[PDB]
């Protein structure tokens, strides 16, 4: 999926306010009504908003929907910790004849200070290269909120294939961890000057780089 564009994460303190954008085309949001779904951890999505701005029974006015041109917004004011969910927009696409969805937005209600991630990047072991294999390991620790985007670079070029990234998970000290794995041939590894692991947390990037010695 991900015909519709959302931000991957947003955060504000309890009592404070936030909005979540939902960006589409002329053939979906442009000509069709947007719905907003709330998913609490380990639970089923719940309809908050339908026909752009009609709240379902029980949903309070601080949850507000709006739509203009080919975009839609979810406003949440009076943030409580019970708001901590993944939020999805959805509508009809008259190009593909599909019900379509955004990629979701992880909402965090700040209970501790903003903490940026520590990144450690390991190159392929001497041993693994003998086996005709190559793995780079990007260890990502001590970030809050618990949402990161990970982008790998070959020299400066975007790498798509051979990437496996975990979902963020809770460390014993209440901060979040994640890891990222890039698979290469030894010819790829040895035929680039550097590979980089790039971790975006709250609009700011932490980059680690290695090189074949």
């Amino acid at each position: 999926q991900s015909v519709l564009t959302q931000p991957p994460s947003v955060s504000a303190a309890p009592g404070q306010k936030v909005t979540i954008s939902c960006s589409g085309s002329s053939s979906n949001i442009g000509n069709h009504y947007v719905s907003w779904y709330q998913q609490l951890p380990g639970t089923a999505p719940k309809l908050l908003i339908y026909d752009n701005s009609e709240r379902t029974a029980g949903v309070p006015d601080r949850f507000s929907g709006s739509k203009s041109g080919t975009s839609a917004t979810l406003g949440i004011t009076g943030l409580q910790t019970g708001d901590e969910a993944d939020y999805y927009c959805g509508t009809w696409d008259e190009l593909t004849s599909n019900l379509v969805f955004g990629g979701g937005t992880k909402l965090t209600v700040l209970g501790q200070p903003k903490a940026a991630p520590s990144v450690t990047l390991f190159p392929p072991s001497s041993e693994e290269l003998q086996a005709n294999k190559a793995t780079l390991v990007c260890l990502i620790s001590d970030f809050y909120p618990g949402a990161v985007t990970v982008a790998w670079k070959a020299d400066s070029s975007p790498v798509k294939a051979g990437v496996e990234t975990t979902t963020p998970s809770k460390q014993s000290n209440n901060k979040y961890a994640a890891s990222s794995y890039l698979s290469l041939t030894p010819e790829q590894w040895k035929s680039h000057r550097s590979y980089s692991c790039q971790v975006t947390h709250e609009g700011s990037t932490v980059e680690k780089t290695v090189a074949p010695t």
Partner: protein
């Protein structure tokens, strides 16, 4: 006063078949338009199938048309999805939902969800590789070094340092589930910059289901 409960999900091989159910209670599903939507782990929602009108008629996403068949038993007040010629990419939690229309379309009731896992992975043992500490070995800060645990099934695996002795620094990261269907994880330990050419770090890895114990040395580059 109204809910949906799915069942039938679990583990199946590539090229395999599987049938999910979704029992309604507190309303008559029969007169309602019903739908299946799915979530590949840590990703968005994909619409799969929908069944409407009195005939009835089925609608499908192109990513499933000719493989999946939606139906309902009005007697058991239950909705079905028959899934044929299954692929690794069909791996996802599957929700049944109630679809209604006013000005536009919306899904106003969702079920609990159910996991569907499509892989070949047999009870395989891991390959362990040393993660040597950066030769950059700076006076300020300290030395990160670890152990890579690659391509195993199923969970879990156990990781220690010097047969228990060393727990001062240890971070053993949750495992990644690969498209291959195999698991990988790594364990890093932050240890003093100095006393590196003297101190002997062995990571000790055990995978029960495969019957695999491995001890790996971790020294810097030459």
């Amino acid at each position: 006063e109204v809910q949906l409960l799915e069942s039938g999900g679990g583990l199946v091989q590539p090229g395999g078949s599987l049938r999910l159910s979704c029992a309604a209670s507190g309303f008559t599903f029969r007169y309602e338009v019903a739908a299946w939507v799915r979530q590949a782990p840590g990703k968005g929602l994909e619409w799969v199938s929908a069944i409407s009108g009195p005939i009835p008629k089925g609608y499908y996403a192109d990513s499933v048309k000719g493989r999946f068949t939606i139906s309902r038993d009005n007697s058991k007040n239950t909705l079905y999805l028959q899934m044929n010629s299954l692929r690794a990419e069909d791996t996802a939690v599957y929700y049944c939902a109630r679809l209604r229309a006013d000005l536009g379309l919306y899904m106003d009731l969702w079920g609990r969800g159910t996991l569907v896992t499509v892989s070949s992975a047999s009870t395989k043992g891991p390959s362990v590789f040393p993660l040597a500490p950066s030769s950059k070995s700076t006076s300020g800060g300290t030395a990160a070094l670890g152990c890579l645990v690659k391509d195993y099934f199923p969970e879990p695996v156990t990781v220690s340092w010097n047969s228990g002795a060393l727990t001062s620094g240890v971070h053993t990261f949750p495992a990644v589930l690969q498209s291959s269907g195999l698991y990988s994880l790594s364990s890093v330990v932050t240890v003093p910059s100095s006393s590196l050419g003297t101190q002997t770090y062995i990571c000790n890895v055990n995978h029960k289901p495969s019957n695999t114990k491995v001890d790996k040395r971790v020294e810097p580059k030459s």
